[PDB]
Amino acid sequence: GKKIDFLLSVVGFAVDLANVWRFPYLCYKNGGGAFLIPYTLFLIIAGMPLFYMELALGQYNREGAATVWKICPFFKGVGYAVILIALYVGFYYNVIIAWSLYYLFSSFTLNLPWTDCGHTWNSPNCTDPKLLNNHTKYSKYKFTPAAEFYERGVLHLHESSGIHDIGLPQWQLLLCLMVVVIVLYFSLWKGVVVWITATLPYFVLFVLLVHGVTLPGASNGINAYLHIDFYRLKEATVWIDAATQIFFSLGAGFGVLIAFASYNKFDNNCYRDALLTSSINCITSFVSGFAIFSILGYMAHEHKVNIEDVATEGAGLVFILYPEAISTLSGSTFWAVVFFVMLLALGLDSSMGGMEAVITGLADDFQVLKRHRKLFTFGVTFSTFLLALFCITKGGIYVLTLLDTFAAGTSILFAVLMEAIGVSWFYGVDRFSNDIQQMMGFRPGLYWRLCWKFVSPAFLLFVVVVSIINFKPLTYDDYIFPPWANWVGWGIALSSMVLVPIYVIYKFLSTQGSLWERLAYGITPENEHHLVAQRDIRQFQLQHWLAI
Ligand SMILES: [Cl-]
């Protein structure tokens, strides 16, 4: 009875829109398996400890992303940075849900629009494998009925020459975005059915696996998935992608975990939560990759194209793959409806989590907003609506790619690294362990403390540095962005990165007293500031810095 509720809760917590939409094309962009090795390694080493850290911080301090830094006042800039990262992601995260709503609306028919050519949106080059009996060597084969539908009857991308000619918003995606935004606002306006939003993703995935294994070309897709290329592992692109996707799927670095845990019971078991979430995430990622590559092998067989060229490597890979596998099921209309309802539910839940992450973080800092949740929610929602309108234009896919590349890459990694440093070195891993013992009754093991203090920061710093010194100019399949687009993306990435040093400078300059007094007040918890006048600061001793 109640244990069923516990199950539903944990499984729903372990699923995300990321695992269903983003992981497929990141695994396919790399070799598959070659992406799972770095994925699992980083998952354990950095993701599990930092997920546990964020949950414990939120639970113990009962604060959001920003105000939780009363323990170490100099990192409120890190809190602000994660809130800004969360605000940036929503702009394009809400457009991926409008796509799901459009596909659901298009799915209410006995002849799915992506099954064959002959529609108003099909180009003369549309090739239906059933209606007819090569393809360069390194193009992405955009002439299939499903790709044609996605890019011309939904995106209308054929009316944009690049990110310099995005055009005007598409009026159908406009209505879908309006509906999504209204639903979010009315689901968030009055405070902080989910049963069927945690079981459906696994039923869909199970059906996908079982059915796609038994397809004419799935064997070669599985063989490609299970073949590992280490010369790919020697490039750091896979490592950067794996780290970013880990922090996307687990929800760390967005302020969502801290805000959600601020409402948890003080005695809730965070260690069990972290273990279960990480295990489910790993298993789900592996199964999702398996099914995705089985479908990719099927399409490679059907279209007589190389597996590396069958589908796009960016956002929309799912909107091509999943319709193409649904069209081969019996009663495909029912399956399309079910699948796109599943996508809508998952996306709405993820957007609600992120928007709540932002609203709670900003309301804890300013009480006026906390007293006017309706108006503040409306403001956040309307800003998101406009900055997402930017992404539903004819060239909106280019803007979405730029955002999905730059709004949480080196920025989210840097923010999580700063969180770990502030919690482990300046606040004290020993103090954090004592707090965890006070909450849950047992102290964290040596592995957790080592990961929090040395291992996870080291790997995070390595990946952050490598993502900067080894930066590949942005591209969308065969399209190469103009040089200024990369500068715009890097400015977007820095807009949140610079909030940490800027706030450190501001806090230092605001505090009164001599240099040492200002430093002590900036590194001491606000509830122990009376000790500063007594010249009793742990951080000014070697024992604090040599503590694990
Ligand atoms: Cl994932």
Side-chain angles (χ1 to χ4, degrees), residues 382-394:
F382 199 56
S383 304
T384 292
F385 173 76
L386 305 166
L387 289 148
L389 278 188
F390 252 91
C391 289
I392 64 164
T393 55
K394 273 73 177 176

Side-chain angles (χ1 to χ4, degrees), residues 18-20 22-24 35 39 245-246 248-250 281 284-285:
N19 318 101
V20 183
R22 195 156 186 281
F23 180 91
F35 178 75
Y39 186 88
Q245 175 62 8
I246 286 289
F248 255 91
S249 320
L250 282 170
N281 184 121
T284 287
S285 295

